[PDB]
Design a protein around this ligand. Sequence first.
Ligand SMILES: [Zn+2]
Ligand SMILES: [Zn+2]
Length: 74
Amino acid sequence: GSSGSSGEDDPIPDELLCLICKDIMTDAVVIPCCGNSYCDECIRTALLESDEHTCPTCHQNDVSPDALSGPSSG
Ligand SMILES: [Zn+2]
Ligand SMILES: [Zn+2]
């Protein structure tokens, strides 16, 4: 050996991932209804998926989509 870089490391932890597609959340958004990490889109589509805007984590009714920590209109 005698080359270097002797040691295994752990990649981005789960805590830094969404509970939907498990993909880096370019724009972490925390929902008020309950509070969870979801991709700017993940949370966007979700609300759509269901008949109406009903948060997946906690059955909500019209969860303030703007409330999210996204000043870019979402
Ligand atoms: Zn996602
Ligand atoms: Zn919720």
